[PDB]
Amino acid sequence: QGLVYCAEANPVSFNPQVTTTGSTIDIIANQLYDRLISIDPVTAEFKSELATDWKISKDGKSVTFTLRKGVKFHTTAYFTPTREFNADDVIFTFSRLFDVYNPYHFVGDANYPYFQSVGIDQLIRKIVRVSDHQVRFELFNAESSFLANMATDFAVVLSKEYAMALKANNQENLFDQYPVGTGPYIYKEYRRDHLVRFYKNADYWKHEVALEQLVYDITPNGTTRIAKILTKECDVTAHPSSAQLSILAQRDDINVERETNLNIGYWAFNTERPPFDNLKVRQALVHAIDIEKIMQAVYYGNGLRARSILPPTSWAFEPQKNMPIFDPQLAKKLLTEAGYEKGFDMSIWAMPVSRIYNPNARKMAELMQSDLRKIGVNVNIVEYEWNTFIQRIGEHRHDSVLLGWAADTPDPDNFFSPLLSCTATFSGKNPANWCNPEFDLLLTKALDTTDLNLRKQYYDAAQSMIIEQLPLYPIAHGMRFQASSADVEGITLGPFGAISLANARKK
C-alpha cells in the first residue's frame, strides 16, 4: 500500500544542507537520507546511524567516526552506484560546507544556512581519511555542541560517486534536484505546487521498508488539508489548524497525535530600521500586546506562554524577571518618552501557514494590529507564499515579523547560534538583524565547556540579554500536533527534529 501526506509547502531542494525550512526538511531528510548519528528517543543518548562508533579526543579537537559496512546508495532512474557508502562520501559531504576546493562548494544555491549560521568554517579545520571506513574530523576549537550538530537533519550523507558522475557531464546542477541517498525511500517525481513521489528502497540497510509508495500532496491552504483528511484524500495531514483540533479528535477514524516540543514563537524587530533600532520603541511596543488574548484566540489554550526564548523543558531554561507586562497605558507613555508620541506606521510580516510555534500568524497579526492601533501605531500586515516569505525576510525587507524556531536537537545552543548570532546575521538568517558580540561571547563560552552547569550559566545570561534588549519578543511555545487516518501506524512525533516516515505503515 501507499500513503498520502498533505504537506504545507513545496520542498525548496532535495538536499537538506541548503535550507532551514521545516517544510522542506520534513519531506526529504528522514525519507531519502541517513545521518552519521541521531539522538535516541528513549535514552536521549547519541545513537548509531551511518557511523557505528565515535571517539572524541581528550582536548576535544578531534572526533573519529567508524563507518557502517554494506550500505548501498539508491539506484534511481538517473543513477546506478558502483560501490557502497564509505569515507569519501562523508568527506565529500561535509567538506562541501566549508572547503572552497570542494567541487560542489559553489554548486546550486551555494548556500548552507544552518551550518554557516553556526560558523562551520571556523569549526572544522579538516576531515582526515584514516581508512576506507573511518574518518577523523579535526576542529579548530572544541565545541560542546559538535555531536549535536552532526545529529541534525541537515547533516545527512550524500553520494560522492553521484556527484562526480554529474561533474564529468557538467550536470552538477542536477545534484541537489535529483537526489541520491541511503534512506528508506527513493526519489521518483516532483511536480512543483502539486506533489512529490517517493517509493520504497528495497535495499535499505537498517530494516525492511513497509510502504511501497509515499506521495506528498502539496496543499498550502490549511482548511483544504483538514477537508482532505476528512474525505480520506490524504492519510496524514501536517500542521493541522489549532481551531480544528477538537473537530478531528471527535472523528473515530482519525488520530490526533501530539508531543511536547522544543520550539519558540516570537515577534522580531528589524533592529537596523528606524524607529525599531531604538530600544525604548521596542520596549514600548511589546507592552501594548495583549498576550493572553493571543493564547486563547490563536493557540486555543493549547499553547504555553513564554517566560524566556527557551521553553521550560529545555535544561538551560530560565524564566526572566523582566518579561514585559501587558499595559497599554505604559506603552503610550514609553512611546511618548521615546519621542514618538503620535505613533507611526509599521509592517508586521505574518507567515501564511501553520507552524508548531504559531498556528496562525495571520490572526496573531490582526490581533496585534488592533492592540497597536490603540497607542497610535498603524500596522499593515504583509504575507507571501511560505518559501517566498522566508526568502524575503532574509533580505530584511520587514519592519518586524512573526516567526520562530522548532529546535533541531535538545542542545540549548540550537536556540541561539542559528538565530541571533553575528554569523547568523551575516548569513542572512537573523530576523532581528541583530549583531551583538557581547551576546555572541556568551554563546562561545557556553561551547567552550561541556559542563552543563557552567553552560547553563552562560545560557541564563543570554536569555536575560534577549529580554533586556528585545531583538525579538518571545511569545509562546506550541504543542506539536499531527492528524492521521487511524489506519496509519509508526509515525511518532518527537520533542525535536523533523518528521520521519521511515517506520510508517498501514493496517
Q: How many CB atoms lie within 10 A of CB 194?
A: 13
The dihedral over CA atoms of 393, 397, 403, 404, expressed in degrees to the nearest 10, equals: 60
Cβ atoms of 308 and 467 within 8 Å: the answer is yes
Taking the CB of residue 44, how many other CB atoms lie within 10 A of it?
10
Residue boundaries of the structural domains of the chain: 1-9+181-259+479-507, 10-180, 260-478
Does 22 show up as a binding residue in the annotation?
Answer: yes
- Asked if 230 and 483 count as a contact pair (C-beta separation under 8 A), the reply is no
Cell, residue 257:
497525535
The full DSSP string for 366-409 is: HHHHHHHHTTTEEEEEE---HHHHHHHHHTT--SEEEEEEE-SS
Beta strand 236-238 with 2-7 is parallel
Q: Residue 207, class by beta-carbon neighbours within 10 Å (0-12 exposed, 13-18 middle, 19+ buried)?
A: exposed
> Which is nearest to 485 in space by CA: 253, 287, 324?
253
User: In angstroms, rounded to a whole number, what is the distance separating the alpha carbons of residues 86 and 129?
Assistant: 10
Compute the distance between CA of residue 305 and CA of residue 473 in angstroms, rounded to an integer.
12
CATH of 10-180, picked from 3.90.1150.10, 3.40.50.2300, 3.90.76.10, 3.40.50.620, is 3.90.76.10
Name the CA dihedral angle for 165, 166, 172, 176, rounded to a multiple of 10 degrees: -90
Q: Which fold has domain 260-478?
A: Dipeptide-binding Protein; domain 3 (3.10.105)
Q: Is 497 annotated as a binding residue?
A: no
- From the list 368, 439, 375, 427, the residue with the least C-alpha distance to 401 is 368
Separation of alpha carbons 302 and 240, rounded Å: 13
448, HSE (Cβ side, Cα atoms, 13 Å): 8
Task: Identify which of 405, 402, 300, 407 has the alpha carbon closest to the alpha carbon of residue 351.
Answer: 402
Phi, psi of 305 (to 5 degrees): -60, 135
Helices 452-469 and 437-447: angle between axes, nearest 10 degrees: 160
- Where do breaks (C to N over 2.5 Å) occur in the chain, by preceding residue number? none
- Residue 478 assigned to a binding site: no
Resolution of this PDB entry, in A?
A: 1.9
Instruction: Write phi, then psi, for 52 (nearest 5 degrees).
Output: -100, -5
Q: What angle do CA 422, 118, 305 make, to 5 degrees?
A: 80
DSSP string covering 56-109: E-SSS-EEEEEEPSSPPPPP-SS---SS---HHHHHHHHHTTT-TTSTTTTSTT
For residue 471, how many other CB atoms are within 10 A of its CB?
25
State the Cα–Cα distance between residues 32 and 501, nearest whole angstrom.
10
List 400's β-bridge partners, or say none.
269
Find where cell 527513493 sits. 186
259 contacts 493 by C-beta, under 8 angstroms: yes
Name residue 359's amino acid. P
Between CA 201 and CA 30 the distance in angstroms is 13
Nearest to 408 by CA among 315, 310, 496, 312: 496
Between β-strands 185-191 and 236-238, what pairing exists: parallel, antiparallel or unpaired? Answer: unpaired
Torsion of CA 210, 257, 415, 393, to 10 degrees: 90
Exposed/middle/buried for residue 507 (C-beta within 10 Å: 0-12, 13-18, 19+)? exposed
Q: Which amino acid is at 213?
A: Q
CB 159 within 8 A of CB 37: no
Asked if 129 and 88 touch (Cβ cutoff 8 Å), the reply is yes
Which grid cell sits at 456?
A: 547553563
d(CA 381, CA 453): 42
**Exposure string (b/e) for 296-316, b if CB count within 10 Å is 16 or more?**
ebbbbebbbebbbbbbeebeb
For 45, residues 6+ apart whose C-beta sits below 8 A from its C-beta are 39
Q: 1-9+181-259+479-507, which class in CATH?
A: alpha beta
Closest CA to 259 of 77, 2, 1, 492: 492
The span from the CA of 360 to the CA of 346, in Å, is 20
> Between 279-286 and 328-338, two packed helices, what is the crossing angle to 10 degrees?
160
Query: What 8-state DSSP symbol labels residue 410?
Result: S
**How does DSSP assign 314-377, residue by residue?**
STT----TTPPP--HHHHHHHHHHHT-TT-EEEEEE--SS-BTTBS-HHHHHHHHHHHHHTTTE
Chain centroid offset of residue 181 CA = 21
Find out whether 355 is annotated in a ligand binding site: yes
